Design a protein around this ligand. Structure first.
Ligand SMILES: [Zn+2]
Lengths: 111, 97
């Protein structure tokens, strides 16, 4: 019924497609789509401590993919640790890019 | 610095949406929304050809033969026919060499 269960694992197209320079100042200011991250601390007995390949990013969701399953964890329900394209670990609260990926690409509210 | 991340950001989801749409209509459609703001919000490259697989009527990722249709015929100024199968919209695009 959902694409997730269909696009699970093809991290391949997320590989030979996702190579933007990953960086904190570039993590919440980037397109969450293929960047690799893990759910270290969350409020969900079934998503804490797990690692997946990011896929979805909307006003109410942030998805990661691994094996034959997906990482369903909103941005405000957990902390995402995406790895820097420089082999550097990024520690950022999914709350910064909470729902609005634009806010970062378009900077804070316009006023 | 913001235009800069947009260059890399836009190009990434852009390639993703293309590779997945084939493999994932929704995702590509999802990023498409993300790529949309990135382009205008971040003030990056202006869309031109993607109109071949994009819809300015309902916004999406269409591919001729799958969820898109394109037809071109000559005989006094050739004209291309493009239309969204999602939001059945009739569009045209002349041909200039
Ligand atoms: Zn359309």
């Amino acid at each position: 019924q959902g694409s997730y269960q269909e696009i699970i694992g093809r991290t391949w197209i997320f590989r030979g497609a996702h190579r933007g320079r990953v960086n904190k100042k570039n993590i919440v200011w980037h397109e969450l789509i293929g960047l690799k991250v893990r759910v270290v601390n969350s409020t969900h007995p079934g998503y804490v401590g797990i690692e997946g390949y990011v896929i979805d990013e909307t006003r109410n969701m942030l998805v990661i993919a691994g094996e034959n399953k997906v990482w369903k964890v909103p941005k405000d329900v957990c902390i995402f640790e995406f790895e820097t394209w420089d082999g550097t670990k990024i520690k950022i609260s999914g709350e910064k890019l909470v729902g609005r990926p634009e806010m970062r690409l378009k900077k804070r509210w316009r006023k | 610095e913001k235009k800069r991340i947009a260059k890399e950001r836009i190009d990434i989801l852009f390639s993703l949406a293309e590779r997945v749409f084939p493999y994932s209509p929704e995702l590509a459609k999802r990023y498409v929304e993300l790529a949309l703001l990135v382009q205008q919000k971040a003030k990056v490259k202006i869309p031109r050809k993607w109109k071949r697989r994009y819809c300015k009527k309902c916004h999406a990722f269409l591919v001729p033969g799958i969820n898109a249709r394109v037809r071109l015929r000559q005989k006094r100024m050739p004209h291309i026919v493009v239309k969204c199968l999602e939001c059945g919209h009739i569009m045209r695009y002349p041909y200039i060499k």
